[PDB]
Amino acid sequence: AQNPNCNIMIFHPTKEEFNDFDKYIAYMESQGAHRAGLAKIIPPKEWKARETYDNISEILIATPLQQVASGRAGVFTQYHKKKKAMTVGEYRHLANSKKYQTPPHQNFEDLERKYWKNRIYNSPIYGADISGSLFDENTKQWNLGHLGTIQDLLEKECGVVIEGVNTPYLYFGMWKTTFAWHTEDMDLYSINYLHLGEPKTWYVVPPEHGQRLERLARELFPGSSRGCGAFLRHKVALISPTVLKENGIPFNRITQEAGEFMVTFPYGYHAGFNHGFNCAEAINFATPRWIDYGKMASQCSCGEARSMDAFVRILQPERYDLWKRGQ
Amino acid sequence: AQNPNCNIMIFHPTKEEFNDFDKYIAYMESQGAHRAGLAKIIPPKEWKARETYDNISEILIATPLQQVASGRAGVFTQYHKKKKAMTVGEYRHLANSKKYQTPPHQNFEDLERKYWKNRIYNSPIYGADISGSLFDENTKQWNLGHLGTIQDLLEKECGVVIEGVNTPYLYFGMWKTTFAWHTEDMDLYSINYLHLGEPKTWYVVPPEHGQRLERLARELFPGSSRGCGAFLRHKVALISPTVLKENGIPFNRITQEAGEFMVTFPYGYHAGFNHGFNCAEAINFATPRWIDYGKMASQCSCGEARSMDAFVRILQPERYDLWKRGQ
Ligand SMILES: Nc1cnccc1C(=O)O
Ligand SMILES: Nc1cnccc1C(=O)O
Ligand SMILES: [Co+2]
Ligand SMILES: [Co+2]
Ligand SMILES: [Zn+2]
Ligand SMILES: [Zn+2]
């Protein structure tokens, strides 16, 4: 077995190796990368997503989300308060203001300490889930808007044509903006490129130990757990590395910097935070190995959790009716 | 001036000519094709959208629309009554049933006569605007899911990056299903491929005479006109070729058959109907020549009309606030 400790692996493809996305994902998994739940891919030195980021200030963040925390420093939930629209230019200026800017710190470890100590006492604003892409149409390699669709993958594997289209999303972040513990919809893969700005710190639980995190979550969020058998689908729960360690949950951490890709693998629980003003782009994808995870993915049917129809309809026909009632 | 009578032109590209989409659209316009408002493109004999259509019955039509008419035979409006979900297999069976099937007829002209005589007395069900594609991912030429985006076109022409993603839609039709008189959102181009089944008959007004149609529409639909300065954006008004002829409106007609593409050009008003069970796929696109049409496109701000944000925001900043109130 490759990567038996489930370490987060870092890959440095050559430009030749960067030319076939599916092939390289499969190569990564041949080295056991998937066992960590997360991998970093450093693009070839001659690769670029686009020429410059000088012309992005007029992008509109239609519904910025103020992330309001409740609980304790290491165990909290966050809810999203909708704010008025602003441009990326206005958002960037807000992120760099005295109220929201990254504080003085010695290094990543000091910043991480400050995040978990102080996160709940501030309510940063996140420009998340904006449909769009910052890849140049002429970028041929690892262009997240030119990947094959999950609908075509399901068709290729299962022989069924389905409706739906999957496209990338942009995430404009600032210091303390947070992504809660979750796996992807239908336990899909995700790929995330950090286009510009300050880093993004990730935490991840190996897929083989995901149920351990779920068990801890039910204990730490009893109200949420009673409300929904798959409440982590609501994407609101945060648990710090110290609390995970206290409870024996196996996990790893890594910091993503501008110009780097992160891939999350099926049923790899992850969470994290942004260091300062940045912009990432992400999309879900599938491989043949995903199908069996799709079939077993837990579903939120309480109505709180936000193409999905067809995947549940085909892979989980028994769940489909009740899941559809929740929607 | 090419094509001064504004005739609908039909093109037969070679496989070599079929290899550069933008180039061929530009070639078509060099021959005056755009003046008609609509063109037909017959693909090369060796081209195909996909291998077979044997595996499409499990596609879900989440919200089939029953098209209910009001008015007179040649001048009517239609509203869409939402029906319960059905699969394409179930829809196809309904379309072929005695209640909904194409009636006996001698030819296209007889069927057209029957449509305009009898359309208002039936309420056919249309599986319209389903996000998805039936093109094989391996189809390299004129794959409507692999076109360059309107957002990238605007960026390339105007130097502004914007949010948004544009993807194709599927249309499952039956006899008498109808598309009302309209131009595309922001007076964009559209491209439509008829994947399978019975034909689709199109009517079109040359872009240079669009305001003549608008004037007639205001006279024929006085209530709708008073309610909204751009009510044709609601996509509910039908006017027959006989009534257009009586009122001196220049127009043309053509019937699209399975395996053929239709392109609508900026500000080319069009309408039509399906002959029987079929499936079409369509998407909007842009070229450099569209920009000036985008800037002048009329907007519905009464709230009735259904990526758009950014195009109005950048090309029509003066209209943006009031348009946003309507939404
Ligand atoms: N929202 C997310 C979800 N999964 C991974 C990363 C993020 C992010 O916000 O960067
Ligand atoms: N809905 C439409 C809009 N424009 C052109 C064609 C159609 C169609 O229904 O085929
Ligand atoms: Co994620
Ligand atoms: Co149209
Ligand atoms: Zn739930
Ligand atoms: Zn209106």
Give how far the C-alpha of residue B131 lies from the chain's centroid of Cα atoms, to the nearest Å.
15
Query: Which tokens sit at B175?
Result: 């006899």
Q: Can you tell me the distance from the alpha carbon of A222 to that of A226, in angstroms, rounded to the nearest whole number? A: 6
* CATH number of the domain within which A305 lies: 2.60.120.650
Do residues A301 and A275 make contact, with C-beta atoms less than 8 angstroms apart? no
Query: Which tokens sit at B255?
Result: 């019937």
Q: Can you tell me the distance from the alpha carbon of A121 to that of A123, in angstroms, rounded to the nearest whole number? A: 7
Matching residue, tokens 């579903």: A299
Query: Which tokens sit at B303?
Result: 């709230």
Closest Cβ–Cβ partner in A62, A137, A159 for B55: A159
Give how many domains chain B has, as a whole number. 1
Count Cα neighbours of B241 within 13 Å in the Cβ-side half-sphere: 17
Expressed as residue numbers, the domain containing B273 is: 1-327
Give how far the C-alpha of residue B11 lies from the chain's centroid of Cα atoms, to the nearest Å.
19
In 3-state terms, what secondary structure has residue B301? coil
Pairing of the two strands A237-239 and A75-82: antiparallel
| Resolution of the coordinates, Å | 2.0
Do residues B67 and B126 make contact, with C-beta atoms less than 8 angstroms apart? yes
Which atom of ligand 2 approaches the CA of B200 most closely?
10
The alpha carbon of A237 and the centre of ligand 3 are apart by a number of angstroms equal to 13
Cβ neighbours around A157 below 10 Å, total: 15
Report every protein residue that has its C-beta within 5 angstroms of ion ligand 4.
Answer: B 190
Pairing of the two strands B178-182 and B270-274: antiparallel
DSSP A204: E
The alpha carbon of A260 and the centre of ligand 1 are apart by a number of angstroms equal to 14
Do residues B216 and B223 make contact, with C-beta atoms less than 8 angstroms apart? no
Residue (of B164, B182, B161) closest to B268 by Cα position: B182
Test B161 with A58 for CB contact under 8 angstroms: yes
Give CA separation, B240 vs B25, B29, B236, B266, in Å.
29, 28, 13, 22
